[PDB]
Design a protein around this ligand. Structure first.
Ligand SMILES: CCCCCCCCCCCCCCCCCC(=O)OC[C@H](COP(=O)([O-])OCC(O)COP(=O)([O-])OC[C@@H](COC(=O)CCCCCCCCCCCCCCCCC)OC(=O)CCCCCCCCCCCCCCCCC)OC(=O)CCCCCCCCCCCCCCCCC
Ligand code: BCL
Ligand code: BCL
Ligand code: BCL
Ligand SMILES: CC[C@H]1c2cc3[nH]c4c(c3C)C(=O)[C@H](C(=O)OC)c4c3nc(cc4[nH]c(cc(n2)[C@@H]1C)c(C(C)=O)c4C)[C@@H](C)[C@@H]3CCC(=O)OC/C=C(\C)CCC[C@H](C)CCC[C@H](C)CCCC(C)C
Ligand SMILES: CC[C@H]1c2cc3[nH]c4c(c3C)C(=O)[C@H](C(=O)OC)c4c3nc(cc4[nH]c(cc(n2)[C@@H]1C)c(C(C)=O)c4C)[C@@H](C)[C@@H]3CCC(=O)OC/C=C(\C)CCC[C@H](C)CCC[C@H](C)CCCC(C)C
Ligand SMILES: COC1=C(OC)C(=O)C(C/C=C(\C)CC/C=C(\C)CC/C=C(\C)CC/C=C(\C)CC/C=C(\C)CC/C=C(\C)CC/C=C(\C)CC/C=C(\C)CC/C=C(\C)CCC=C(C)C)=C(C)C1=O
Ligand SMILES: COC(C)(C)C/C=C/C(C)=C/C=C/C(C)=C/C=C/C(C)=C/C=C\C=C(C)\C=C\C=C(/C)CC/C=C(\C)CCC=C(C)C
Ligand SMILES: COC1=C(OC)C(=O)C(C/C=C(\C)CCC=C(C)C)=C(C)C1=O
Ligand SMILES: CCCCCCCCCCCC[N+](C)(C)[O-]
Ligand SMILES: CCCCCCCCCCCC[N+](C)(C)[O-]
Ligand SMILES: CCCCCCCCCCCC[N+](C)(C)[O-]
Ligand SMILES: CCCCCCCCCCCC[N+](C)(C)[O-]
Ligand SMILES: CCCCCCCCCCCC[N+](C)(C)[O-]
Ligand SMILES: [Fe+3]
Lengths: 281, 302, 240
């Protein structure tokens, strides 16, 4: 139940709520007040999803789907079977995610580490909340949120995107994708670098960080370094999610036409709008 | 508040670092570039040196030839007009030959031949750049992990522009050189293949792409959270576990009930990333060669 | 159908890969243990991988993992409950005993070496010709604790030579001796360096180094652990 080095760290303290009341573990898992809160929220939500499955008449995981209120409901309540369960399952989800972050904070405090992890997690939560809470509220209806189903959530992404033409043309979307791709590029490189040093050619000694700087300078003429690369991956992946949330919070609210047409502002700038030749003249 | 280690508070500089020698031919190394105080709030201030050599030069020249072949076409499409060039920059496109030419190199310059020349220069630029990631590791006695990882990205690239078109019977299947037009190609590819959301490899590719952002947010965050115990010194923590690596592990064990090591996280890392373009390349390669319509395939799962 | 075969095959590959990844990540800290240090009954479904050996540079030896795990130090803690899964209370002063958030690992009592075999970390005065290139120079500033009392004064920066970064501040105490404070645990301001983790009276307790121009992996762990530990254990004097 414990890693070989673990016991020296399992001291009392760090909790945010309840003092010593929930200061304990179950196997490897820390509990705390927010472990209890997460369990409650998650269990309710799972129960409510299962109830929704009964009301839908299916126990197939690829068929179970929980849809938000229809647009006609606006921002008010809906009968359980017609959007109300979705509404409650969403409260539970939010409760579970935030509780999970806050339990992470308690773990940080016990372990004497920085709060970077739950801070990063909060971006994922905010992106979620953008899709199910902020955007629907700004657009005036819960029905704009995505449904909870494996395949039906994909129908919503497709339908939402095509509502605006080819969604590729959302400029915020473009920046988001750029961070996602750059992140995966950097993850591959960080992964490969450290391992190429720790696992050198057969029989050779482990290489040093000096060798890692050297390699990358040889290759591209720059090396960010060992602190920098962990700063970079954090930034790239959090930027990806930030611009994801941006690209959606602005769609159906400040811009709601075909995203391809937004780009016309550049083409119709007075000093070249009318010059013949090219694609747009 | 607590200092968070996103930007450094104090920069230090010493003699330009010319790096490890091992088996590197030092004749082929430049001297240092300038030092960037700006860069140094976040990462390393030092620029260069870089390594030249014959493959380097080949790759670089070939890469510029690619870029300029596309740029020439763009100017031409702009009617040599500087103001039209900028206005229509994202609308210009260098397109492959039409289907009629199949895989032949017999298409006229203005109708595919230039695309082929651009593509030729790209092929040698990339592959010679790959040989470079291998050789720079070799010369340093390092493992070949970078070149192995680069190969997974190369696989998707190769599938899109070379393998798939060859298997499909024509260069007209390949991707055009242009900002907006590469996007339209992407949208059209999905439409014509029954919606890629029904391609199980596209779905995996997404899981891994999102997975990379999850994992690098996790790892980056963790290292910064333990940088107060020298956590980013990953190689010495591998060789001699410190409290940084133990608190990192235990953070995750307590949270989710399992954890990594200082070496193993970097194996989770490399695989999460390479799996993106691995599964991706397979999903695209099967499209139109074995499966016409993913939706249809999905209805039979076969 | 070929695409069916491919996807079915990929799932098999992926299960094998996860298996490989999980076992690779068991090269430290396993086998699992009970709270008394003995082998736990339930190890889970993943077995330890075949050992690998890292050749350490500069004749420092090898490391083989997995291998026999031991703390190699006393742990001043005791059970607070009659069953598994509860916290273990410090038996003495957790700051001095090096437990909880103040913990340290028994790393090699030698300095980290760069690629040439030279000490990785040096005080700036002994590093040619390293100097502050940007940001406020902390050398000379008074060092204030979370109690808002002056604990000492910055007399140097310990720098990472191959990576050209600040790693510690060397701080002189009322008695003329010095301590290292990790760079990540200080706020450099225009008129002071502020240390949130420690009140002034805990500065003397910071583990000292044995040679004044080098620091060992072991000494680094004790310093960093001790200073991090103050967040939890100095909290009575903060009040912030
Ligand atoms: C089709 C698509 C086309 C594919 C295109 C591109 C693919 C790119 C793949 C990217 C590889 C990145 C991984 C890097 C790595 O760790 O290995 C470096 C490894 C050595 O590392 P190095 O950097 O040279 O030196 C450092 C150390 O000495 C040694 O370094 P090390 O310690 O890191 O090496 C350890 C490594 C040992 O090295 C290797 O062998 C590398 C290999 C490769 C790959 C397998 C690729 C699979 C692709 C997916 C297949 C999908 C199917 C559909 O062990 C593994 O990582 C292993 C693999 C896990 C596979 C598990 C299994 C699945 C099977 C099972 C199911 C069973 C039961 C479940 C139910 O590379 C090799 O030399 C292997 C050469 C292979 C030659 C084969 C030629 C055949 C003729
Ligand atoms: C036909 C469809 C359209 C299109 C439709 C749109 C639409 C619509 C959307 C996107 C969004 C995205 N698109 Mg798009 N887009 C398409 C073309 C693409 C292409 C491409 C190569 O063609 C790419 C790369 C992208 C990529 C992008 C990303 C930038 C972004 C999704 C990531 C994200 O928001 O994560 C953010 C992360 C989350 C939301 C997850 C958070 C979950 C956490 C908090 C909790 C989960 C815990 C729990 C349930 C786990 C269970 C417990 C178990 C134990 C594990 N799009 C086409 C053109 N795109 C989405 C977006 O930006 O959303 C903000 C979006 O809504
Ligand atoms: C982010 C932008 C869009 C989005 C667009 C897409 C697209 C496009 C795809 C997915 C796909 C995935 N999405 Mg989605 N989807 C979004 C919202 C989410 C949310 C959420 C906000 O809570 C969740 C839980 C999921 C989860 C799912 C998974 C079923 C699937 C694999 C993702 C993955 O590996 O992620 C990376 C993270 C990890 C690798 C960690 C592992 C955690 C995963 C496996 C969580 C599983 C949860 C699921 C089974 C529900 C469990 C809830 C239970 C009741 C507890 N999506 C929004 C609406 N999603 C892919 C798919 O194949 O769908 C069929 C796919 O092609
Ligand atoms: C309307 C659009 C379609 C769609 C059509 C496509 C198509 C088509 C493809 C993808 C593919 C992908 N899609 Mg999709 N996709 C859509 C829906 C989405 C959504 C969503 C709705 O939220 C998401 C998240 C995604 C996500 C993704 C990615 C997982 C995947 C690309 C991975 C990658 O890293 O490529 C980026 C990496 C590369 C391209 C490799 C780069 C290679 C190197 C060698 C290039 C060298 C460059 C160098 C020469 C340039 C020099 C410049 C430097 C300064 C030196 N898709 C919808 C359904 N998608 C790809 C895939 O594999 O699918 C199976 C793909 O071909
Ligand atoms: C911001 C950058 C990226 C990121 C970072 C990130 N994610 C995080 C954290 C961080 C740093 C972790 O600390 C935390 C973690 O513990 O990781 C293992 C986590 C986490 N990110 C997770 C998943 C995840 N993150 C996502 C992605 C991202 N996370 C971003 C790309 C995605 C995507 C891209 O779709 C997924 C699916 C979990 C593994 C974990 C959080 C686990 C958790 O909150 O558990 C508490 C609650 C439960 C156990 C389940 C509650 C169930 C609900 C009550 C009901 C279900 C409702 C749900 C809305 C239905 C969804 C249906 C789907 C079909 C759509
Ligand atoms: C496998 C997952 C991800 C991945 C992995 C990956 N990519 C890789 C690598 C790996 C590990 C390599 O090691 C290699 C690399 O060297 O990285 C730094 C690379 C690489 N991936 C790159 C880009 C890239 N990767 C992509 C993404 C991905 N790569 C996936 C997300 C993408 C996307 C998302 O579309 C892009 C575009 C390059 C940075 C690099 C490959 C370098 C290369 O092949 O170069 C060939 C061409 C040239 C040498 C020059 C081209 C000409 C330029 C257009 C002009 C620029 C000016 C010039 C540099 C100045 C010179 C002038 C002088 C005369 C002064
Ligand atoms: C250098 O450092 C580092 C490490 O360490 C040395 C690390 O380990 C890690 C951690 C990283 C890994 C181990 C890599 C693998 C992880 C991923 C690929 C990310 C995706 C993760 C999953 C798919 C697992 C998700 C499972 C979860 C979230 C746990 C599920 C648990 C339940 C059953 C939930 C129920 C409620 C609980 C547990 C709350 C507690 C309350 C009660 C039990 C009551 C990182 C990042 C790191 O950088
Ligand atoms: C300012 O003006 C100047 C001219 C000075 C500079 C400006 C230049 C400009 C503006 C250039 C712009 C470049 C752009 C916009 C290009 C971007 C292209 C994109 C987005 C690429 C996307 C996809 C690329 C792929 C998938 C290509 C794949 C290529 C291959 C796999 C190579 C295939 C090999 C072939 C067909 C050759 C066959 C030869 C043999 C070996 C038989
Ligand atoms: C521990 O080593 C790490 C660093 O420190 C030595 C880095 O320097 C780099 C390389 C940094 C760069 C230039 C990012 C590459 C991606 C882009 C944005 C093109 C990697 C991969 C890394 O692992
Ligand atoms: C709201 C979505 C429905 C919840 C799905 C339940 C999770 C079970 C795991 C899904 C795996 C699918 N599978 C392989 C069983 O078919
Ligand atoms: C992808 C990052 C690009 C790095 C830029 C390349 C910097 C190399 C500097 C070499 C110049 C040396 N110098 C000053 C003698 O000319
Ligand atoms: C490196 C290990 C990470 C593995 C993550 C696996 C996520 C599974 C995603 C399900 C994809 C479903 N499907 C059928 C579309 O392929
Ligand atoms: C992709 C779905 C992931 C769900 C599985 C979560 C993995 C947690 C495993 C940790 C189990 C720890 N323990 C000791 C209770 O076995
Ligand atoms: C795709 C991500 C799947 C990761 C979950 C698989 C590993 C979790 C269980 C590991 C067991 C931990 N344990 C019992 C050895 O401590
Ligand atoms: Fe790392």
């Amino acid at each position: 139940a414990l890693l070989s080095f673990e016991r020296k760290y399992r001291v009392p303290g760090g909790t945010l709520v309840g003092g010593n009341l929930f200061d304990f573990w179950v196997g490897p898992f820390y509990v705390g007040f927010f472990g209890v809160a997460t369990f409650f929220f998650a269990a309710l939500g799972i129960i409510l999803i299962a109830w929704s499955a009964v009301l839908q008449g299916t126990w197939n995981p690829q068929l179970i789907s929980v849809y938000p209120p229809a647009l006609e409901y606006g921002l008010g309540g809906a009968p359980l079977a017609k959007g109300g369960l979705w509404q409650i399952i969403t409260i539970c989800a939010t409760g579970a995610f935030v509780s999970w972050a806050l339990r992470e904070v308690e773990i940080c405090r016990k372990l004497g580490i920085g709060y970077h992890i739950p801070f990063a997690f909060a971006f994922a939560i905010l992106a979620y909340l953008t899709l199910v809470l902020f955007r629907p509220v700004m657009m005036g209806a819960w029905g704009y949120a995505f449904p909870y189903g494996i395949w039906t959530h994909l129908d919503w992404v497709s339908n939402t995107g095509y509502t605006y033409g080819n969604f590729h043309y959302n400029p915020a979307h473009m920046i988001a994708i750029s961070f996602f791709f750059t992140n995966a590029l950097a993850l591959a490189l960080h992964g490969a670098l450290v391992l190429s040093a720790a696992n050198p050619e057969k029989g050779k000694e482990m290489r040093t960080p000096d060798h890692e700087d050297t390699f990358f300078r040889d290759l591209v003429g720059y090396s960010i370094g060992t602190l920098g690369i962990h700063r970079l991956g954090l930034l790239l992946s959090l930027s990806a999610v930030f611009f994801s949330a941006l690209c959606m919070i602005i769609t159906g609210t400040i811009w709601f036409d075909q995203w391809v047409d937004w780009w016309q502002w550049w083409v119709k700038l007075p000093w070249w709008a009318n010059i013949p030749g090219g694609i747009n003249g | 508040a607590e200092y968070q280690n996103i930007f450094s508070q104090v920069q230090v500089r010493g003699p330009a670092d010319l790096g490890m020698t091992e088996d590197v031919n030092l004749a082929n190394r430049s001297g240092v570039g300038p030092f960037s105080t700006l860069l140094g709030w976040f990462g390393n201030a030092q620029l260069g040196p870089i390594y030249l050599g014959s493959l380097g030069v080949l790759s670089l020249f070939s890469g510029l030839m690619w870029f300029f072949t596309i740029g020439i076409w763009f100017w031409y499409q702009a009617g040599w007009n500087p103001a039209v060039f900028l206005r229509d920059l994202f609308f210009f496109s260098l397109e492959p030959p039409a289907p009629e030419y199949g895989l032949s190199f017999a298409a006229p310059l203005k109708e595919g031949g230039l695309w082929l020349i651009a593509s030729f220069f790209m092929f040698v630029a990339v592959w010679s750049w790959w040989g470079r990631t291998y050789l720079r590791a070799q010369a340093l006695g390092m493992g070949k992990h970078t070149a192995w990882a680069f190969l997974s990205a190369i696989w998707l690239w190769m599938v899109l522009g070379f393998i798939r078109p060859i298997l499909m019977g024509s260069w007209s299947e390949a991707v055009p050189y242009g900002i907006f037009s590469h996007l339209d190609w992407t949208n059209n590819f999905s439409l014509v293949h029954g919606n890629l959301f029904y391609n199980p490899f596209h779905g995996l590719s997404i899981a891994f792409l999102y997975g990379s952002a999850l994992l690098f947010a996790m790892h980056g965050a963790t290292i910064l959270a333990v940088s107060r115990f020298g956590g980013e010194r990953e190689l010495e923590q591998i060789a001699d576990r410190g409290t940084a690596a133990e608190r990192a592990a235990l953070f995750w064990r307590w949270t989710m009930g399992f954890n990594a090591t200082m070496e193993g996280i970097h194996r989770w890392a490399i695989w999460m990333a390479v799996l993106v373009t691995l599964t991706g390349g397979i999903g695209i390669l099967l499209s139109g060669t074995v499966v016409d319509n993913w939706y249809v395939w999905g209805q039979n799962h076969g | 159908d070929l695409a069916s075969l491919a996807i079915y095959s990929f799932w098999i590959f992926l299960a094998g890969l996860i298996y490989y990844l999980q076992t690779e990540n068991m090269r430290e800290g396993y086998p699992l243990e009970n709270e008394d240090g003995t082998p736990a009954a339930n190890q889970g479904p993943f077995p330890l991988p075949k050992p690998k050996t890292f050749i350490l540079p500069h004749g420092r030896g090898t490391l083989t993992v997995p291998g026999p795990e031991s703390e190699d130090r006393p742990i001043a803690l005791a059970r607070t409950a009659v069953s598994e899964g509860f916290p273990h209370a410090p038996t003495g002063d957790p700051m001095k005993d090096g437990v909880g958030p103040a913990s340290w690992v028994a790393r090699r009592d030698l300095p980290e070496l760069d690629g040439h075999g030279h000490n990785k970390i040096k005080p700036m005065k002994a590093a040619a010709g390293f100097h502050v290139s940007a940001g406020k120079n902390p050398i000379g500033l008074p060092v204030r604790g979370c109690d808002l009392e002056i604990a000492g004064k910055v007399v140097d920066i310990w720098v990472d030579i191959p990576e050209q970064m600040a790693r510690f501040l060397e701080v002189e105490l009322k008695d003329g001796s010095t301590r290292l404070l990790p760079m990540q645990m200080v706020k450099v301001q225009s008129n002071r360096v502020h240390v949130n983790a420690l009140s002034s009276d805990l500065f003397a307790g910071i583990p000292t180094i044995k040679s004044p121009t080098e620091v060992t992996l072991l000494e680094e762990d004790k310093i960093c652990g001790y200073v991090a530990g103050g967040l939890m254990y100095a909290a009575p004097k903060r009040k912030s």
